Every structure is written in structure tokens, then in C-alpha cells.
Amino acid sequence: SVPSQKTYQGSYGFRLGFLHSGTAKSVTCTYSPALNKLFCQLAKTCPVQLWVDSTPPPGTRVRAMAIYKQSQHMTEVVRRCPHHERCSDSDGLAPPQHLIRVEGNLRAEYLDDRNTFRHSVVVPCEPPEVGSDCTTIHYNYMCYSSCMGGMNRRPILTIITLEDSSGNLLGRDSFEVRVCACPGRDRRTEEENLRK
Numbered sequence: 720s721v722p723s724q725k726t727y728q729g730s731y732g733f734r735l736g737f738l739h740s741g742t743a744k745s746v747t748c749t750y751s752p753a754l755n756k757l758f759c760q761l762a763k764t765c766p767v768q769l770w771v772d773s774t775p776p777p778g779t780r781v782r783a784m785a786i787y788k789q790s791q792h793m794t795e796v797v798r799r800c801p802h803h804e805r806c807s808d809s810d811g812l813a814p815p816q817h818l819i820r821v822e823g824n825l826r827a828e829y830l831d832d833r834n835t836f837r838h839s840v841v842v843p844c845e846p847p848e849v850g851s852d853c854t855t856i857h858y859n860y861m862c863y864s865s866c867m868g869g870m871n872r873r874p875i876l877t878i879i880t881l882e883d884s885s886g887n888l889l890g891r892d893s894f895e896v897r898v899c900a901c902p903g904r905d906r907r908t909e910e911e912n913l914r915k
């Protein structure tokens with residue numbers, strides 16, 4: 720089955736936010752609002768903001784999952800390729816098969832769904848650091864979009880869900896991802912293709 724990707728702010732007014740990192744050739748992570756698409760280098764830090772209008776209950780969690788964007792591929796589980804799943808770049812918590820990791824959160828949990836076989840990573844939803852207006856999660860993507868035997872050039876979406884302590888839906892947002900060598904150039908290219 721295919722998880723829903725419908726944007727849903729829910730009772731707490733949940734939505735994501737992204738930094739404005741620009742498109743210099745050296746940039747390692749950059750988000751395009753026009754494309755709703757994050758471009759990032761392999762295994763590099765991707766800051767994703769969580770914004771709410773009101774405080775969700777203690778025990779609320781935030782889950783990330785990848786799916787293929789194209790209709791003809793949506794039913795296939797997104798996983799790391801046969802090379803990367805074996806490169807022993809473990810952080811001690813993430814299964815080596817999982818495309819999406821949360822970086823630097825000891826409370827991260829990784830799920831292999833018993834029915835759909837899909838992978839996800841979930842962390843507690845926490846209030847912002849003192850002085851801040853939103854909470855930031857740092858994600859890593861552990862294969863290139865081009866990895867043979869993995870994503871194999873097929874575009875993916877990351878779905879972020881706000882969940883209660885039982886796993887029930889409280890909110891949902893999503894964005895496309897391209898993991899590539901030169902996120903700055905690729906964002907510029909794709910934005911120009913869109914303008915054309």
C-alpha cells in the first residue's frame with residue numbers, strides 16, 4: 720500500500736520550514752520552495768524545521784518516511800542500494816538498509832513495518848530551545864538518487880507525520896528530495912526548467 724501524502728495541518732497547525740541556503744556550487748543542502756524540493760549531498764546534515772500554532776501533548780512524535788513520487792513506482796519500498804546497505808557506515812542506531820536517518824538524537828527509533836515493509840525513523844516532538852520559535856530535526860539521506868539497484872534515478876518524497884503516542888495521525892507535510900553531488904547547480908537547473 721501507499722502511505723498518504725496529503726498535507727494536513729491538524730489541530731496543532733503543524734507544518735515544516737526550511738532554511739534559505741542559496742544555490743552556490745559549494746552548498747550541501749538547499750531547499751526550493753518553487754519545486755517543494757530539497758536538494759542535498761549524500762549523508763550530509765539536512766535541517767528541517769517543525770512549526771506549530773499550539774503545543775501538542777507530551778508524547779507526540781515526528782516520523783519521516785520516503786516513497787517514490789511517480790505513480791508507477793509508488794508501491795515499491797524505498798531502501799538503500801546493494802552497495803550502501805553494506806558499507807558499514809552505521810551510527811549504532813540506524814539499520815544499514817534505511818535511507819533516512821535522524822542525526823544526533825539518541826531517542827530516534829527506526830521501524831521496519833511488519834505489513835508494508837516500509838522503513839521510517841521517528842523521534843519525540845520537543846518544544847524549541849530557549850530563544851527559538853521552532854524545533855529543528857537534522858536528517859541524513861544515505862544514498863544518491865542515482866544509486867543503481869536503489870532509487871535508480873527515480874524521484875522520492877519524504878513524508879513527515881506528527882503522531883500521538885499510539886501512532887495516530889495529528890498532522891502531515893511532505894517534500895520531494897534529490898540526493899546529488901551538486902545540490903546548488905541542480906536546484907538552479909530544475910528551477911530554470913520550471914520557469915521555462
Ligand SMILES: CCN(CC)C1CCN(Cc2cc(C#CCOc3ccccc3)cc(I)c2O)CC1
Nearest residue numbers: 769770771772773774775776777844845846853854
Ligand atoms: C507563542 C507562539 N506559539 C505559536 C504561535 C507557540 C510557541 C511555542 N510552541 C511550543 C512548541 C511545543 C512543541 C512540543 C511538544 C511536545 O512535548 C511537550 C513537552 C513538554 C510540555 C509540552 C509538550 C513543539 C513545538 I515546534 C513548539 O513550538 C507552541 C506554539
Ligand SMILES: [Zn+2]
Nearest residue numbers: 800803862866
Ligand atoms: Zn546507494
